[PDB]
Amino acid sequence: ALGDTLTITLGGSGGTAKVLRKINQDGYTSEYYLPETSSSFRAKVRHTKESVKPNQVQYERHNVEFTETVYASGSTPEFVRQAYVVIRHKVGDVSATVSDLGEALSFYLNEALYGKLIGWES
């Protein structure tokens, strides 16, 4: 699963296509990396389940992160750009409506909404 490389098209559909390489794997976690002359691309996948409690609900959290960092130039130091998403639900929940909610969240976010969001427009 997850192949030996993770494809990413920065800029949405129709953008420049990069291909990160599988570089590490442990305990349901895996990570992809690729070096570039002025920057680098980082992508990791993690899973986790919380411990059992006497009288509570057992939940599971997924996480996916993309990270992008550019090397220093002149006096300007290095800086990194990243964005990650998580999903949380009970152990035995129905998968399909969870997928529906995920589709909702993905569809809501678009380039226009990102532009509005970065402008601190609450």
Partner: protein, 372 residues
């Protein structure tokens, strides 16, 4: 030069005789001929392909005898004649494809590196800072820079930290230059194991002095792995200056403030420090805390072995015939070479504690114009 070599060993031999009229009419001989032949290349320092074909036997000889009128026949301690052919081969297995590309892709050691601090740009300028500060303080006493909470002790602390950083970078450079030797960095991967078993029936084991039939079973095993060596590209290495001046500088620093007040300070090795700090600064800024590398050739080794074991079937043999169990083994090995498209990788040089030594050196709180 490529040579083909053949070699053999004797596995077993025995005797079988037939009597008639009280005479040994036929007393023919039987031989088991352990065989192997190899190919290899010598005289070239570079790694070469090689392969081996190899086979052995293991036989429990027959026994017994039968009697007739004025004649008999006997095969005591006589290995079966079936071994005279000894033709055996490995079982078919799934074919591998593109092993070299996958090995080259998975094996790449490039990975992110520690971020370069801001003062690395000013790294080349440290020596004159210290020299001018010490000279001005000596000329006008210690009262200088009391407005900045500065003095002799902070200066000595900062220069000691700089020597520590210089030695650490020196040792790391020494290690890199050692690594360039002995073929570079080697890595290994595993490419799976294939196992298969089958059954065979009705194998005739002997065709004289009666007849013998035995069952047959086969086992097949295959391994596959690959190795490559990653070596730094020539000219990308860091400076490799040796260093005994730092020992002398540390010896001077041990004299204390009183010693430096005396003529001791004029003994500092300013020129060496300037040269090496400039070299290391220009190198670090040229690269990004990384050394380049390129891959050598990619090799794959695929050993294959099989076992051929038999059990005697007694329902199609003369009653006097006893035993005859035997087994055989066939082994092959191979070494082959491949190469792929050009690739370059980056490996971190120094991390964390290496670069954090002098990130907060105290002299930075004095304005530059007084020094400059």
């Amino acid at each position: 030069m490529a040579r083909i070599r053949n070699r053999s060993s004797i596995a077993s031999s025995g005797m079988s005789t037939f009597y008639l009229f009280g005479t040994p009419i036929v007393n023919e001989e039987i031989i088991v001929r352990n065989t192997e032949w190899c190919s290899d290349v010598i005289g070239n320092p570079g790694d070469n392909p090689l392969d081996i074909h190899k086979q052995e036997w293991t036989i429990k000889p027959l026994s017994g005898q039968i009697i007739f009128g004025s004649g008999t026949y006997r095969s005591l301690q006589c290995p079966p004649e079936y071994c005279r052919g000894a033709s055996l081969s490995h079982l078919s297995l799934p074919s591998q494809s593109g092993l070299g590309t996958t090995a080259l892709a998975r094996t790449n050691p490039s990975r992110p590196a520690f971020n370069l601090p801001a003062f690395i740009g000013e790294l080349r300028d440290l020596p004159r800072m210290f020299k001018i500060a010490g000279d001005t303080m000596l000329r006008k006493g210690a009262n200088a820079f009391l407005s900045y909470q500065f003095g002799w002790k902070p200066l000595i602390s900062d220069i000691s930290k700089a020597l520590d950083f210089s030695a650490t970078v020196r040792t790391r450079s020494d290690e890199w230059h050692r690594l360039y030797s002995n073929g570079g960095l080697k890595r290994r991967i595993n490419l799976g194991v294939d196992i298969e078993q089958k059954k065979e029936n009705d194998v005739v084991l002997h065709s004289s002095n009666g007849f013998v039939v035995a069952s047959h079973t086969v086992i097949t095993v295959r391994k596959t792995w690959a190795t490559v060596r990653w070596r730094p590209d020539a000219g990308s290495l860091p400076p490799i200056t040796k260093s005994s001046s730092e020992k002398h500088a540390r010896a001077l620093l041990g004299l204390g403030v009183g010693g430096l007040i005396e003529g001791a300070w004029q003994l500092m090795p300013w020129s060496w420090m300037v040269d090496w700090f400039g070299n290391v600064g220009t190198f670090l800024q040229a690269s990004n805390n990384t050394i380049g590398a390129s891959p050598g050739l990619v090799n794959i080794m695929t050993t294959t072995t099989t076992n051929h074991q038999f059990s005697v079937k007694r329902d199609l043999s003369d009653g006097w015939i006893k035993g005859g169990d035997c087994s055989a083994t066939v082994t092959s090995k191979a070494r082959s070479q491949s190469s792929g498209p050009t690739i370059t990788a980056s490996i971190p040089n120094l991390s964390g504690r290496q670069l954090s030594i002098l990130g907060a050196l105290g002299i930075q709180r004095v304005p530059r114009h007084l020094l400059r």
